[PDB]
Structure formats: C-alpha cells, structure tokens
Amino acid sequence: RMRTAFTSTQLLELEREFSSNMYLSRLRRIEIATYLNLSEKQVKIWFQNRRVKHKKE
DNA sequence: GAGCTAATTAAAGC
DNA sequence: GCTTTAATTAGCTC
DSSP, rough: OOOOOOOOHHHHHHHHHHOOOSSOOOOHHHHHHHHTTOOHHHHHHHHHHHHHHHHHO
C-alpha cells in the first residue's frame, strides 16, 4: 500500500486513546475510526505499531 | 479464525 | 544520507 499521513489532531486523539485503552474492541475501533475520519485498518495498525514502541520504552 | 506479537520492509519528511 | 514510522508477513494462540 501507500503510507497514510495523519494531521496533528488525529495523532493527538489517537494518543489520548492509547493513554486510556491500549487495546480496542472491534467496535471501539470502528467508533474511533468514524470520529477521526480514518479507516478501521488505519486505526488497527496504528495501535499495533504504538504498542511495539511503548514496550521499547 | 480473527487477532495478537516480532521481525522486517521501505516510504515519509527532512 | 539519516530517523521515524505505516505497512506487510510469518508465526502463535485461544
């Protein structure tokens, strides 16, 4: 695929979620996606990569 | 059987 | 050329 870019707002809301939840139901993933104007796959992969980063730190 | 972690790959912006 | 990170893949597990 081609890489997605996120606005500063989207990144800040995605990282507010990761602060509370670190894992998401399939339903919450669709919620966040619709609120953020993102697709479900974009939210899913962001959360996967974020967890990898969070362990390394 | 979707969904998770790890290890990559390589595209994105400088 | 460099660093950060979105995306893919192989493997495991309930």
